[PDB]
Amino acid sequence: SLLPVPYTEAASLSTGSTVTIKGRPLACFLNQPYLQVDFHTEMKEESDIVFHFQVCFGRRVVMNSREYGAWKQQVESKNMPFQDGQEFELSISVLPDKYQVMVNGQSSYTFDHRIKPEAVKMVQVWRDISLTKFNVSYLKR
Amino acid sequence: SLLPVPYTEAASLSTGSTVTIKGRPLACFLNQPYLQVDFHTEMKEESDIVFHFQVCFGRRVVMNSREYGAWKQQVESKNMPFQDGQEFELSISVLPDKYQVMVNGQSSYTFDHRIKPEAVKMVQVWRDISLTKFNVSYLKR
């Protein structure tokens, strides 16, 4: 639709930052479209990932980090608040101890900080979605 | 790039038909972009799939069919002729007994017919690729 996918934006994060993502899957759940949000330590797409968030719509969600080029301990969830064929509003909040992922206003996943959020320099949103809004909040000291 | 992805084209297949697909992954292999080619029995994207071909670039290839809404016996391959960061030329030939998948001119995968290729009405190419050429050959009786 509006914002080009894969979508990449330079970014900085700290306690109190929020990343808001509004979009829609590009296929019905039967075809298992994916959505991936990666918080990167550099603009380079092969850089390390502080928070890796991958939805296989209708199936599962995987969360992990990639440190010095290697994937670490994968966290896997079957919680699936996303609705087949529907627009979704995704909200990732940086709390002192973890990321909190709200889906359509509902707390759905958390991921404890493995690397300080201040290490993030870029956010990329990609795979099988269209994107209508992307925002990183910059209101706190 | 040029052809919109997800790419859908009404199609008919029989022995001697070839599907040619030229494209490029949207991310380096470290980020595991996907490519999926589905030969559908109807234009509806939730319709059955006669030949499902899914590349996880740099990792594996999965082939299957989806019959009356259910996935059947998955075939899995570690053969990975695709090259990191490179354009690829994909050629799926309809032989009497199977599909033969050429990658950059090199025979790479085959998949025995589970449903007659004459059941195909649509081809969809999607996931993490850009597309520059798509062609279905229509030269044989």
Swiss-Prot record, chains A, B:
Single GO cellular component term: cytosol
Superkingdom of source: Eukaryota
GO molecular function: carbohydrate binding; identical protein binding
Galectin domain ranges (all copies): 5-137
Site feature Not glycosylated, where: N135
Tissue expression summary: Expressed abundantly in the bone marrow. Expressed exclusively by eosinophils and basophils. Not detected in monocytes and neutrophils. Expressed in CD25-positive regulatory T-cells (Treg) (at protein level). Found in intestinal tissue from patients with Celiac disease, expression is directly related to the histological grade of mucosal damage and to the number of eosinophils found in the duodenal lesion (at protein level). Found in sputum of patients with eosinophilic inflammatory diseases such as asthma (at protein level).
Main location: cytoplasm
Subcellular localization, as worded in the UniProt entry: Cytoplasm, Cytosol; Cytoplasmic granule
Keyword DNA-binding set for record: no
Keywords: Acetylation, Cytoplasm, Lectin
CDD domains: GLECT
Residues that bear N-acetylserine: S1
Subunit (UniProt): Interacts with CEL.
Role noted for this protein: Regulates immune responses through the recognition of cell-surface glycans. Essential for the anergy and suppressive function of CD25-positive regulatory T-cells (Treg).
Name the record gives this protein: Galectin-10
Organism: Homo sapiens
